[PDB]
Ligand SMILES: NC(=O)c1ccc[n+]([C@@H]2O[C@H](COP(=O)([O-])OP(=O)(O)OC[C@H]3O[C@@H](n4cnc5c(N)ncnc54)[C@H](O)[C@@H]3O)[C@@H](O)[C@H]2O)c1
Ligand SMILES: NC(=O)c1ccc[n+]([C@@H]2O[C@H](COP(=O)([O-])OP(=O)(O)OC[C@H]3O[C@@H](n4cnc5c(N)ncnc54)[C@H](O)[C@@H]3O)[C@@H](O)[C@H]2O)c1
């Protein structure tokens with residue numbers, strides 16, 4: 141079959157890309173905006189960075205900083221609520237995947253009221269109308285939610301993180317600039333960073349993978365690999381690189397899927413509020429082994445673009461170098477090696493496994509996985 | 523400053539991507555389409571490939587096959603005309619850069635009546651409204667007009683081919699499938715193909731160049747370089763590869779510019795009806811030389827991805843390998859080596875040089891060029 145690609149029809153890159161917002165707004169005559177964000181972000185004067193420009197440019201805006209890490213259906217509802225009573229024309233998502241994924245949720249439902257519940261929006265959410273125009277402004281080195289046609293919400297009730305995929309999510313314009321992301325504490329940079337790396341690697345070997353997708357992913361890996369460290373260390377230049385690499389990774393996996401690393405990470409989110417960045421970080425290497433054999437020459441390239449001199453290695457050799465380069469990075473970035481460090485409980489392995497087994501992302505894994513295979517993984521990752 | 527990226531918000535790739543058309547139209551309830559095309563394409567049962575699917579899907583369509591190679595203002599007017607009298611909800615561009623560039627022209631003017639002239643639309647076209655939704659379906663290994671924000675028109679009167687640039691031009695969906703391109707005779711595959719390679723190389727070294735754009739271009743070069751030959755010799759899989767590479771190149775140069783090769787080729791089109799592809803083809807290597815020194819390590823990369831073992835080479839060495847790899851391909855592909863072979867006159871070089879000096883593309887050249895410098899070029903290319 142043919143492959144479909146869904147990208148931002150417009151996107152801005154580099155320190156100060158946020159400056160281009162006011163004009164994008166004008167250029168397309170929007171009247172009022174609902175800013176969807178964190179309270180942490182508003183307090184740290186990050187949102188101000190945008191509202192201030194909007195103010196000077198005389199642009200109307202209202203805020204909703206109700207989002208919390210791992211956005212729940214109640215948050216999404218509260219937002220839709222705030223949205224419906226603002227004369228808001230569009231929305232601006234300032235923040236990581238949470239406020240951004242929340243924002244996409246709000247945009248879709250506000251036009252597909254049909255799906256007010258928000259369960260009914262999992263998988264390929266059967267929407268008939270494109271979401272309210274949304275401007276994405278990421279503040280983290282990961283998610284790439286600014287380009288992906290997907291959002292994940294948490295159903296606290298059913299302690300399970302569910303993924304929603306719909307080409308109707310996609311922002312009209314994405315503003316990617318490290319200036320908005322400089323605030324990230326080291327731990328946060330590392331976490332989001334590795335999430336992006338995870339995104340890149342899982343998309344390079346996902347099942348839908350093909351020419352364009354592979355090209356994008358491998359490049360993203362390359363970028364991420366050679367900068368996450370310096371960024372976590374503070375090098376602002378490396379931060380700008382990260383900002384790009386995470387975005388590139390999104391251009392790919394969004395249009396092609398991921399794998400178990402994400403499938404085995406979501407349940408971990410829903411179960412212990414384990415930061416996605418950290419979850420993937422911990423699994424990734426292990427899941428990579430579990431996948432090694434079903435990835436042809438892939439890992440060779442992965443190992444290469446990560447500094448490993450894969451020259452003269454055997455495919456098996458390379459496959460270990462790759463998995464190892466990863467382990468190496470997490471350690472060098474401060475991510476705990478085991479799930480036991482992040483409070484995962486063995487008595488839950490069975491539950492999680494099932495949660496993962498079902499999770500939408502899993503299907504994209506190059507190597508089918510059985511409940512037991514996964515159980516095995518969670519353990520050997522504990 | 524920041525870099526802005528403008529891509530297709532939606533694109534389909536692969537043999538049969540045209541199949542996804544009917545649905546797209548539906549998933550976004552349009553009503554009627556004006557097919558902008560050739561007669562050659564019509565007679566060759568190529569447009570049928572689309573009209574047939576639309577008919578079966580019960581989609582209304584009207585055709586306009588008045589386009590000709592290197593489309594003139596009169597053609598663009600005649601089209602706008604036919605369009606303004608059809609009940610045309612949106613338009614579908616089936617064909618190379620001509621029917622596609624014609625189509626974008628028609629789409630823009632039909633919403634920015636302000637420029638019914640078509641000179642008043644050169645450079646950064648000051649349009650205030652986005653063009654009529656246009657679905658691009660390329661039939662050639664080049665142009666990439668389906669993703670670039672620019673169309674070029676011919677002012678037969680003031681015989682000079684002028685480039686028009688405007689983010690409003692951009693098609694809503696692009697359908698890239700080698701099935702539409704299989705008809706290209708070898709000389710055509712060759713010509714359009716090298717045009718694509720030309721785009722990739724020029725965009726890789728154009729002044730606006732940066733991270734994302736460098737990545738895209740270098741990948742495109744890689745793809746094109748490794749398939750054009752096979753495609754021209756008949757390999758359908760090589761054809762599918764080309765289809766992608768040319769599109770990829772578009773993703774880059776559209777958003778960053780080109781250089782002299784295109785600036786020196788346009789006047790050649792306007793003057794002698796020289797196929798854009800063959801013109802670029804002939805110049806390219808020469809212009810590359812004139813540029814070598816102002817392209818850092820760029821050529822080294824170019825040479826590599828073209829099969830050149832740039833291993834123990836000096837930057838000078840590599841730079842020559844690159845320019846050579848090109849000469850090598852043109853030959854292998856059947857493109858005449860001198861402008862004299864394509865009827866270029868030596869009495870006119872001064873005219874052309876001026877024409878090129880004024881061409882919008884030129885300014886992107888990494889090395890400033892003077893009228894005389896260009897004259898030098900046209901001569902050493904004759
Ligand atoms: N389905 C998928 O493929 C996929 C992929 C990636 C992420 N996700 C989802 O994305 C979310 C992860 O988002 P996230 O990692 O950005 O975190 P987040 O936004 O959920 O939380 C980040 C925390 O860091 C703070 N923060 C955010 N940006 C900051 C900045 N620039 N400076 C200082 N502090 C900042 C916030 O205030 C917040 O407390 C999860 O909900 C996850 O499930 C899904
Ligand atoms: N601004 C830019 O960057 C840029 C880049 C490339 C070209 N251009 C312009 O675009 C045009 C280039 O168009 P083009 O060379 O792709 O082709 P075209 O459509 O202009 O003309 C192609 C000719 O080849 C025939 N043809 C096209 N597809 C065919 C197929 N599948 N099978 C058999 N015959 C086929 C057509 O019938 C026509 O006669 C030129 O007018 C050029 O000036 C601009």
Ligand SMILES: [Cl-]
Pocket residue numbers: 200227
């Ligand atoms: Cl108000």
Ligand SMILES: [Fe+3]
Pocket residue numbers: 283335336338339402416420
């Ligand atoms: Fe993730």
Ligand SMILES: [Fe+3]
Pocket residue numbers: 665717718720721784798802
């Ligand atoms: Fe061209």
